[PDB]
Amino acid sequence: HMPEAIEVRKVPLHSVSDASELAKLIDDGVLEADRVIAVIGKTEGNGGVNDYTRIIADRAFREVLSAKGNRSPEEVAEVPIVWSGGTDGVISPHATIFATVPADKVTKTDEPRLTVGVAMSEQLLPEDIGRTAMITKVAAAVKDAMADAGITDPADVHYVQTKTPLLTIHTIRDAKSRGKTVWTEQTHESMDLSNGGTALGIAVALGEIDMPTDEDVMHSRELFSSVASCSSGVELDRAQIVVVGNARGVGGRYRIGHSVMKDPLDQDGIWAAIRDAGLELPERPHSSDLDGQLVNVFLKCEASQDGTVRGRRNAMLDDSDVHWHRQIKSCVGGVTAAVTGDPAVFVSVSAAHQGPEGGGPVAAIVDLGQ
Amino acid sequence: HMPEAIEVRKVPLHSVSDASELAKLIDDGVLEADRVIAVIGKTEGNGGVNDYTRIIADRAFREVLSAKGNRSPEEVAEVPIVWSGGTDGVISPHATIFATVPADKVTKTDEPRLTVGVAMSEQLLPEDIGRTAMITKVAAAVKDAMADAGITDPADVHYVQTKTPLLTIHTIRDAKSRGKTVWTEQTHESMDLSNGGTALGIAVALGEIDMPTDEDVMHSRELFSSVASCSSGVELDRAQIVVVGNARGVGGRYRIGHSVMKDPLDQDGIWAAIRDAGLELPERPHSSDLDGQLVNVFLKCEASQDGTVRGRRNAMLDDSDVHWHRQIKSCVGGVTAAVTGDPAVFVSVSAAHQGPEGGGPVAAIVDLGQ
Amino acid sequence: HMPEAIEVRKVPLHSVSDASELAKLIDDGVLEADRVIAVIGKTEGNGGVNDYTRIIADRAFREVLSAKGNRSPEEVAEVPIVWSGGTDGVISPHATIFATVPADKVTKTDEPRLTVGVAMSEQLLPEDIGRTAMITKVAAAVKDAMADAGITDPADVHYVQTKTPLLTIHTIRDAKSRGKTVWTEQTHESMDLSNGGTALGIAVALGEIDMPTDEDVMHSRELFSSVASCSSGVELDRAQIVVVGNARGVGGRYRIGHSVMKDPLDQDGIWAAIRDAGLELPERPHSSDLDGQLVNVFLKCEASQDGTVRGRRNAMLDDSDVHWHRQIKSCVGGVTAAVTGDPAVFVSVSAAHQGPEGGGPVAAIVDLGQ
Amino acid sequence: HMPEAIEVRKVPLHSVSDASELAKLIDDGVLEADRVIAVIGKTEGNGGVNDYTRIIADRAFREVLSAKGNRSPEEVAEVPIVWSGGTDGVISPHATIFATVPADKVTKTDEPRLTVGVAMSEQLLPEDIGRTAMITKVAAAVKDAMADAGITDPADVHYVQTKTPLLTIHTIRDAKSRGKTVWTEQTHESMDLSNGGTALGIAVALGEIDMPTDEDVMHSRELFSSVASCSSGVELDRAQIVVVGNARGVGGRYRIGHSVMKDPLDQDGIWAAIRDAGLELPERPHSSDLDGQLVNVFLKCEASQDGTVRGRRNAMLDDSDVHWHRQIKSCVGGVTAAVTGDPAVFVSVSAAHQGPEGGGPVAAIVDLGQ
Ligand SMILES: NC(=O)CN(CC(=O)O)CC(=O)O
Ligand SMILES: NC(=O)CN(CC(=O)O)CC(=O)O
Ligand SMILES: NC(=O)CN(CC(=O)O)CC(=O)O
């Protein structure tokens, strides 16, 4: 329960089943396998429903964690690992690894430094998905995780990465066998609904919004969290919550900060996250100012329902050829990598209630040590 | 033959068949229909072979030019109009209109101001496409156009927008009936080949490279033009050349400049084009510095054959789901619109021999008047 | 109001903007432009939202009808013309033209022969779409059209081709300005909802089902019409109904029949439609038995929500790369063209409440004359 | 070297990583793991370059073969397993398993019964791919495999399933380091080239054609094998050949036959393969005649370069949205499954020199036992 200092490393994936850079970090003593508490990565699949790159990476990474540690494959299975597929354009497949640091390697400081808390919610039934029961169950797990990270002020929470169930053929039918209804009968739509409801639960937990109603979900886009990054996948019947923020008195060399991207072109929002994280930059920063101190950024993007960016129409929402999810991801990947100078960026789509409409939250993790 | 001063206006398309903003410019006396000499735009189709948005726009625009002028529909048919389809991500459909200015509306100056020259090459036979016969025929038409713009120094050419034939079922077979071979038998590939060969012809005309050989085409990517922007489409059996540069002693309020984007994230390359065009900007510019003085940028993009950007792997070239053409366009659309602050940007793909590999030329047109 | 004898001709489109075969039929005296009462065709676009091939064909065909007749372009605009885009696989672009026959060219018979009735429903408001108000307004227009065709027994209705509104940004917002809700906020989904609600209205009008409830729409797939073929498109704020059946005492040389395809592979269902239309065939027919007597077939297809065909799983519903609409269309295009021997077949997708789940209605028009 | 009797079983895949039906066949004593000599299956990925479903299935199947047998994972790695991805439309993921039968389970007969031979070619260098060196190396390995199956008359070869290298970034560059050229620089194209050259090598080995020249490859489509089914994938630097035919004096209960599909709608070609395999059927067969005696069919399909089927134009080759590979696969999947009544059919694309243009070979394996 007490927070520990964190080591965080961003590593490339050299192929779909590659975990060799994790293995290397362990071999070289940078981190200990059994101390890996979360992994959050980008994989090269389509970013849709039938994206099998997520399970390939998952197997490769868990295999390393089981092989190089004393944890059993069962214990290793409980480690939250979130793979956001789809690396359209320049986005480079990668994983960000979070591990606790042994006491004999930390210098405690009163400065804010990175902390991580993890929680699983109560079981999320198909008829919960996208409705206020999901919102309340999420909210309670987010408070659990926040406590687990040592954080009492929501202002010190900067990034809440989640994973929640989808609605499948199997679960839609289970609901129906019990005389329950589901919000939608399509798998694809349910990913966006699942993320959106979860986001609302985050927003409620952190005091960003009042408890909303069922009719708000997917509709009242003015209600949102400024720190939620939600993902979904068949593997669970609960929400997995990873809270990332800062705490004082922990030590460590990393710090997290955040802002929002107001729209897909809002580079200044990204720079604002980096400054918030504690890097001192010029008034007009450039990627060349970073000198290896930016570990990663994590952000959400979306096409707004109004079909416009900076007053100009685009055709993303009507495009039956290439889903707007993939279009906007590629676009924002560029806008983001142009700030960071590094195409290994965590850029995710499906952003309902995650940041303002047409935008998204952005978190930055920086290295403030020697 | 003598150059005239140019008025250039960028207008949105509000729908696929909309030319109302052109009609408005004519009604309001900004330009005269019969003085429109070129149009270069972005349309909302797929950007591929079966993109019928190009012909829809074409009809809409030519209808206005015929209705509001004294030119016959035949004369109006000779006006070069280039539609680059595919507006992935935020890119906004639009057209940039170039028109000559009556003598009683120009103040002649020795400063460099925008000039346009136009030429059609000799007939380009199917077995010419992608080979040195195309290169030589292009080169001669580019010299013709350069002369037509009043430009003697290639250093004053900043943007050469072209349109060249594709290879179709019909033409591949014509070649064969005469006992000729073609470079490739696939329509899709032939668009990229056609643009690449044309680019080489531009590079030869301007002294950027020595005359290459057949085996160089599509292969020697170190050979390229820094001003070529080439497009292709079934409508022609000749190359249409639009040379855009500057000349002194013409007058007008617009000026063009250029640079190259070294890779997809090279915002500084875009800013370099804008400075070259004559806008004085801060050392680290931001879009908010532009205050309506940037008319448009025109640039090419591509995924490099090495599969990497700033040393990080991406999976664009292996992606059988969404062609890398569309991925990179969306990405670079974002990177570009982030510089200009305006999603109406001319961003095109198919860049062989147009700028360095993985990059492309970028031209900027700025308004230096009151 | 009284029914007339019908001439029906299926013509290819040689390109996206080609109506030359219609022009030819008129020039050769096969039919009169002013007597064309409906056109139903397949166009080569993507079959999705951003399919601009439908408007191209529409313009080309209406231009012929206005040029070669005495009807004004306004009157010609009232002719129902339905374009179902997406010709995946072998499906060949084409149009089926229905025209009335002058009295001096008909031999009246008591045999059932083809008749067509047309109606427009009351205005369909955005909050009607997919709900019982749509169902009732449709139902009344279907009764209107049935009467217009001279049909009193629903058993003589074999094919009801419709066109209904979609929900757009504009209409979703109009609803909201009046304090109304809409069934869904996504354009793509609303096409399927619009067709499904319309189908239910057809089923109610013909006595195939009892009046359903709002919650049935898109959900109770056991409720369906065996003759409905519904399509949607922004051009209208009403439903356009084309009823095609038979009546006795009219004359003419064509007759229509129908059945259902129980699943995507149900060739026997197609053969059953052809027999029902009045062609005498062997017990096990083959395409070579048809000898030019099959004008066309018109049918719907879909992937079932259970993810299976003849007890075998497929992955259509999870496929984020190529929408199942396009997969199933291509599949059923083959299965269908294999029966008819002619790839010009009207195969459409979006089949909720149109035929049993995983299947669809199929109608056949045959030539029983000399 | 001497041929053995063969047991062949077609099993579904219930998910991407499922080999449970293979495991079940082994547990139930139907076949022995160590006697599995080839597996040929369909997987649910995109059927393109970035199809990771093939490696998932591969791992799942080899894991079973290693776990349930005495072969080492190294020996199990030598078993030819060919996964053809892309199950567009109704096609159901599945694997066909071939195993030898112990002598105490066979009744020797002079009737033709199924035999399998396997060979690996000499190393295939990048500059071999698509050229006559590939053709000769293939041809020799096909003769090797034919001998390994006990077949001296090519007329007894009915299906030759292969796997050959692609050209990658890595291999294209290796070629270049040795001062060699490659046929094409694009991975996607090289899959089709690789299959086409291999097919030609099969055709040469079996006496179907004379040795062709480099310029014939991909161009002279009148040259083809009537039994070749070629696939490609990064895993090899040699061709893997699986010859399937019949031999007399072996015994077993299965027999193979073949024909060709002349075009995508040629159901009679499929029925001809089934008859050739030895099933007695009515003059006009129907799927209901099969009564469980059809194990599987294996066939190739393609869009012809002339853009037509049974004299009607389609738009497959110009479609930049959904590649014609996927369109034609879905179409032919339907046409095929309609014959077999079973959506688990091996339908593959990339058919240059495999069957006539616009068509493909089709082989059928039937169970003639009790
Ligand atoms: N809900 C999700 O996981 C959305 N994912 C889906 C996927 O990862 O395949 C896309 C993304 O994260 O950008
Ligand atoms: N060769 C071309 O015209 C390439 N075009 C093709 C098209 O416009 O549809 C894509 C682009 O210009 O970005
Ligand atoms: N609702 C529709 O019109 C469905 N359409 C959409 C389209 O035609 O673009 C697809 C089809 O008819 O097969």
Ligand SMILES: NC(=O)CN(CC(=O)O)CC(=O)O
């Ligand atoms: N060359 C190949 O393996 C072609 N494959 C590619 C793949 O399996 O992903 C498609 C098919 O076999 O139908």
Ligand SMILES: [Mg+2]
């Ligand atoms: Mg948002």
Ligand SMILES: [Mg+2]
């Ligand atoms: Mg380039």
Ligand SMILES: [Mg+2]
């Ligand atoms: Mg149905």
Ligand SMILES: [Mg+2]
């Ligand atoms: Mg073939």
